[PDB]
Amino acid sequence: GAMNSSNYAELFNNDIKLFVDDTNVYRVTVHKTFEGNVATKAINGCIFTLNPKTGHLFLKIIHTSVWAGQKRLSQLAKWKTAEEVSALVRSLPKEEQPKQIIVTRKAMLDPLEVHMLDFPNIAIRPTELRLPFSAAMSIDKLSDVVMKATEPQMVLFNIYDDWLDRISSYTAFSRLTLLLRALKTNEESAKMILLSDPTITIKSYHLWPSFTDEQWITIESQMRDLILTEYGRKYNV
């Protein structure tokens, strides 16, 4: 059934699984018309499909052309997400297909179940975890590939860079979710913490800076402090 704090080690076992987050699929700016009415303008979006064990990220870019002349776009966005996850599964060799797909939003369950009827042995599950994957568009290199896209495109990344050389999946997922939670809570402060020291750069083939093990411990500390600082700011606590 549902994935929670109890069954958290399950994310890092040897059963292939993917998280699917549809938050950034349908993105708009709301603006005034000449007549003083309100209208939306869509911008490019993305499906965030992640293997939490390997860090493999299937970033399906959703170009604004897929909305042209469609109605009820927030509903269509869930079905388009399900269509593209189904297409990704069918594109993978059998031995690479997931055994489980976990959706971050319960509204994705029916659309994905219906698109995956051909795969009765792939479990489609919700989660009780509040995951910060909405903040993926705060990672400069992911934001850049989404906004530059002129057509539908899939881009493959490792969201853990080379971390699994030095740490476990459990710890890499912990680091990723802390970084994304900090970027979601205070994007300016989070980026200041990550890029404050010019001597530490991002490799051309990486998303995050090249921190030594001791520097990651300091960065992780500074991210936890930011989340606590912001919690005090929000609730006057």
Add this chain to the structure above:
Amino acid sequence: MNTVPFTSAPIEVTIGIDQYSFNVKENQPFHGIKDIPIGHVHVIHFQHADNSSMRYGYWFDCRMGNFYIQYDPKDGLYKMMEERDGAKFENIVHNFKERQMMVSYPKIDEDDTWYNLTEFVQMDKIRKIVRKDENQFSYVDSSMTTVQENELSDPAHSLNYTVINFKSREAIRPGHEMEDFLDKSYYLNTVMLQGIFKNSSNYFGELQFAFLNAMFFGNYGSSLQWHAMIELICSSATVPKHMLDKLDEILYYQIKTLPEQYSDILLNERVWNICLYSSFQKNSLHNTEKIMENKYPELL
């Protein structure tokens, strides 16, 4: 007007005949039911006074043979049987009527309730849902499961209702996933009506039979099937005008007949609220919406 004689009534029992019911005492001189209207299916049903466990009964059509009831003290139930000797049967009935040992099917001349509940129900269609080919009549009880319930155990004793599943390859054309899930018209019109039922009359017959088994036996799988067949129509944007008008009449008489005190167990809140207020057909069921709002406004 036809007769179902009883050999005897050795155990105290509530007897139903269609929408009517009568209490019979242990060894009361009761020899059956006369003046049963020709032209309709009927149901004769039982609930034992000493064990309200198992409601059970028999669907039959007096045009298809001479039927009687006899208690079996081994199996502990009232059994339907066919008498193949016409002259023996005629002599039995004549004697019991002459001695006034039978209750009369109590039809009011103005009253079209039973026709309105059974309009599309055919004995030959019942015998395909309830498979026991050596009898012309069909046994149903409280506990019998549906083929769909047995997928999600003894298949010979099952109710073979048409399986309806909104998240099945049958319901959803590859490439029309959103379309077919949000608008069930494909599944209703091509798969069920043209494909399996052949016509709306057969679809309504199954819907009506499922309702009657839910009401008369408290059969849970029958109640699930009744709601699934209503939801499939109400969830379809494209339904023939004659089918919507007929469904409104069918549901009106079903809601009219339901005992007020069984509404909590026989009616599914989600399905009715969805059908009356959210669905494509929310404005198409005027008579059903009015009786539901006036009789069961709590459910809504």
